[PDB]
Design a protein around this ligand. Sequence first.
Ligand SMILES: CC(C)C[C@H](N[C@H]1CC[C@H](n2cc(-c3ccc(Oc4ccccc4)cc3)c3c(N)ncnc32)CC1)C(N)=O
Length: 447
Amino acid sequence: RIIVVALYDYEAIHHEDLSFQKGDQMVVLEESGEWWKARSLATRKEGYIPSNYVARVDSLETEEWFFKGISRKDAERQLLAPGNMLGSFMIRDSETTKGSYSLSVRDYDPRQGDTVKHYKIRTLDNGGFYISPRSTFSTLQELVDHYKKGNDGLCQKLSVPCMSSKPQKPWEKDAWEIPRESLKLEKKLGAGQFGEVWMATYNKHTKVAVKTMKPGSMSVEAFLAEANVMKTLQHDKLVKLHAVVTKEPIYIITEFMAKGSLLDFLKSDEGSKQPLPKLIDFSAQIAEGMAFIEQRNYIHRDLRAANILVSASLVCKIADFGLARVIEDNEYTAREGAKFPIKWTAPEAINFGSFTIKSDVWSFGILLMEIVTYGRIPYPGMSNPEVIRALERGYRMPRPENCPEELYNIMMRCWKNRPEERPTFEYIQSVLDDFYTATESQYEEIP
Ligand SMILES: CC(C)C[C@H](N[C@H]1CC[C@H](n2cc(-c3ccc(Oc4ccccc4)cc3)c3c(N)ncnc32)CC1)C(N)=O
């Protein structure tokens, strides 16, 4: 008997699902995947439900100011998003203290601009919580109501909970390999060497993107084996693979990303106006994605701004991870020109076909330069043979205008000729995540 309460408004997309009145009471049965079967209270008939729309009644997951799952870094991004105000806040699980909590509050000063301050919410041994010992509370709800009435030592008085959008409905049960007929291709987004990309509708109810691979470009079995690894690479900064059509021409089905590639974005009216701290935040988002790929012993093989996608809310998501591996070299793909771009590719990958996480690190440094130049071609003024020979003699792209020296230093580290000398994405992540907050403490010590 596990009791669970609803949270959002959702009607059955399928024919087996129930209703959500933004408030209800349910009791879960089986807990496989992201769809759960639950015994509900309207009234004595049930079915399957999306797990991300519900929560246990005991935990704080029901509270509007609590954000389960998210990181410190993501708390900051969420809060600094447009639509939030001074003293906007959230409570989340602590990162550096298991079982305890953290308060994140949107702040402002003329000297540092918009910032997010973090406070340790310590738990008392016999029940209750405090930030400062002189002010303890039975519940986190009491803590919140307290600091809503006055800052009492915090940077700001709490105003309203961090805004949040209703999450993506989880993908249909056991719909990994789907029929081609289940997709309606509505708008061609782009045409490339080995396939096209379409905006499309799945089963007349869900917006997706579909990459349609050219006949001759991939083998069904080799692709499916690889895709079965790709789908498990689940992370906020990787684009999500929903499903595949396992019949030539092979279709790849993913979440749709409203702002297209980061390269397109940086070259748009809107993206060309992003300020440098936002550019650095894109870099950090990609580094986080790559550190996950690195921790999972996977290889991207074609990391560049063109293969980064951008959401409506400016989340960067890595796409085409691993795809280059299963694009075949034959008479068909050959008449399409270069398989990989020389200017983005590590020298050992070019010279010997040695693709590793370390050649991805090389590509990342190039991507960094693409970002800070808003999508300029690498090595301007140079041919491909000229780039290769210059690189062999220690030439590296010089630092451009409007590039912080520490960002350049990171690029130069990525561009070591010997791969073992290049940093880890775990390192790159940490430096970029803390780029502007290096000489600052994690949490504020409130008297
Ligand atoms: C200005 C532009 C109109 C020009 C155009 N730009 C193009 C830039 C990329 C655009 N694109 C590509 C994908 C995508 C990427 C990989 C996928 O598959 C995989 C495979 C393996 C792993 C992960 C995803 C699936 C979808 C995609 C998406 N999901 N949502 C929105 N736009 C997308 C398409 C236009 C161009 N001509 O370049």
